[PDB]
Amino acid sequence: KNIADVLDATVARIEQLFQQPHDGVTGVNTGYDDLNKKTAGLQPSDLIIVAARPSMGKTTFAMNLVENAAMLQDKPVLIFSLEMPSEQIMMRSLASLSRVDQTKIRTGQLDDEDWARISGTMGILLEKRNIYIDDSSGLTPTEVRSRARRIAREHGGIGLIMIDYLQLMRVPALSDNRTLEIAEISRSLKALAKELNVPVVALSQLNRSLEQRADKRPVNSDLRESGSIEQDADLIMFIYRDEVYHENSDLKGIAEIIIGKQRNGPIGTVRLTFNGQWSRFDNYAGPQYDD
């Protein structure tokens, strides 16, 4: 068996798992091409776990997905903000969508150019009426569920569910045992995804332990210490920014979404551009440099 025959076999095994199995987005449009190719949209009845260390932008990424879902789809998206107040989040989304520096909204002067963009943004959000935010803190799975059901009955189903980190949720009955508590939360969110037949994006923190490693890119194994989240999850995405860990790097303004697990299809990394100023992610323009 010569080199040609054996190399034929090797490229085949790569060729098989490289290509995506879906033609077009079956799930909800993420608003990011490389991610749409890898996931085929966020699938109904899939528990999706967006997990990262602090300062990676896990919350803003998840919020970008909901912002994109609101524009590219008419049915309602539901956001449970356990961390921040409703209005504190929405001001951030205005900056994100309108691409205006967030500091300028808070303190500095807002340009006539800047004012115009947020006016347009707000008009469109008022037109659609897809975004429903719940700032109630320390919610139980039953509360989260019944509230999601209420929105599903009173309007045209549900498009997307968003949980500002999962660890803020709680179950009184199991509150004494933290591992059991998280196990029930993750299970209930999966059950909820099925009933309403909707993707639920549930954020999660990661403990410091991983930062003792040399390669500090999160691995799936870092969720068993949190609890039974990895088992229940159908799609797991980690956010990593080399810039925060290393003073100077080949890539500086670049972030990367690492798919740790996907039932639907392939595992892999997707590189995105990140903006700290207006808190939004963008597609990477690697394909065409052209000098």
Binding site: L97, R99, S119, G120, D282
Partner: protein
């Protein structure tokens, strides 16, 4: 919807008008602005 849109523009000067009338136009601009800036950033740090 009516009275809330009134107060929206009382904050701004009188001469401003909305840059986008639909969400599709916003995302067209979002990709445009993102594409060019991502290329610009990539160009700068490589250089």
């Amino acid at each position: 919807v009516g009275d809330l849109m009134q107060r929206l523009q009382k904050m701004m000067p009188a001469h401003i008008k909305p840059a986008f009338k639909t969400g599709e136009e916003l995302l067209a601009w979002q990709k445009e602005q993102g594409a060019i800036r991502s290329a610009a950033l990539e160009r700068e740090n490589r250089a």
